[PDB]
Each structure stands twice: as structure tokens, then as C-alpha cells.
Ligand binder design. Sequence first.
Ligand code: XP5
Ligand code: XP5
Ligand code: XP5
Ligand code: ZN
Ligand code: ZN
Length: 52
Amino acid sequence: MPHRFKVYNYMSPTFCDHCGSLLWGLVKQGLKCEDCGMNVHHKCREKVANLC
Ligand SMILES: CCCCCCC(=O)OC[C@H](COP(=O)(O)OCC[N+](C)(C)C)OC(=O)CCCCCC
Ligand SMILES: CCCCCCC(=O)OC[C@H](COP(=O)(O)OCC[N+](C)(C)C)OC(=O)CCCCCC
Ligand SMILES: CCCCCCC(=O)OC[C@H](COP(=O)(O)OCC[N+](C)(C)C)OC(=O)CCCCCC
Ligand SMILES: [Zn+2]
Ligand SMILES: [Zn+2]
């Protein structure tokens, strides 16, 4: 099933579940899936399989 990613403000350092690199920045550092909690870079979103 597709994910439902929504922009998220990460309060502690957090790494992208797709590529492994840090979700760097002060705010809105990436996207969190509302249904499974996966965290991704904005630009990793299209690389993620529809396996929510
Ligand atoms: C030496 C690190 C160089 C890269 C800088 C990345 C960074 O600063 O944020 C990654 C936070 C920072 O850890 P913190 O210093 O904020 O404390 C959390 C550590 N622990 C989870 C064990 C309680 O670390 C983690 O939570 C887990 C990943 C640690 C290895 C990543 C290189
Ligand atoms: C905090 C100390 C740890 C240093 C960071 C370690 C690290 O993970 O570096 C790698 C990620 C790369 O993330 P990027 O935001 O460049 O994009 C990765 C996703 N995609 C390639 C698909 C677009 O890039 C960064 O995070 C570095 C900061 C980039 C700009 C800061 C002025
Ligand atoms: C004096 C103003 C400094 C200029 C920096 C721009 C800024 O205000 O912060 C913006 C970024 C978002 O990243 P940026 O908009 O700087 O670049 C995009 C990075 N990526 C395409 C990989 C997502 O949002 C953040 O939270 C990071 C804080 C700044 C780090 C970037 C150098
Ligand atoms: Zn999901
Ligand atoms: Zn990523």
C-alpha cells in the first residue's frame, strides 16, 4: 500500500530510513509516514516502494 508522507519537524537527530543519511536542518527536515512512521528525505520519497 502507498505510504502517506507528511512533512515533520524532527526534534532529535534522525536518519532517513531509505538512504541512511541524516535528516539535517533545523525544521521540516524530512517526511514521516502517518501510517507506519517511516522517515525519509523529501528527495528520497519517490525512491520508496509502496510497501506501507
Ligand atoms: C559521531 C557522529 C557524527 C555524525 C553526526 C550525527 C549527529 O550528530 O546526530 C546523530 C545522533 C547524535 O547523537 P546524540 O549526541 O544527540 O545522542 C543520542 C545518542 N544515543 C542515541 C545513543 C542516545 O546519533 C544517533 O542518535 C545515532 C547515530 C550515531 C552514529 C551516526 C554517525
Ligand atoms: C551534523 C554533522 C553530520 C554531518 C552530516 C552527515 C550526513 O549524513 O551527510 C549526508 C547528508 C546528505 O543528505 P542530503 O540532504 O544532501 O540528500 C540526501 C538525499 N538525496 C541524495 C536523495 C537527495 O548531508 C548532510 O547531512 C550534511 C549537511 C548538508 C548541508 C548543511 C549546510
Ligand atoms: C542565513 C541563511 C542561511 C541559508 C540557509 C537556508 C535556510 O534558511 O535553511 C534552509 C534549510 C533547508 O535546506 P536548504 O534550503 O538550505 O537547501 C536545500 C537542501 N536540500 C535540497 C537537500 C533539502 O532548512 C534548515 O532547516 C537548515 C538551516 C540552514 C542550513 C542550510 C545551509
Ligand atoms: Zn508508511
Ligand atoms: Zn534519504
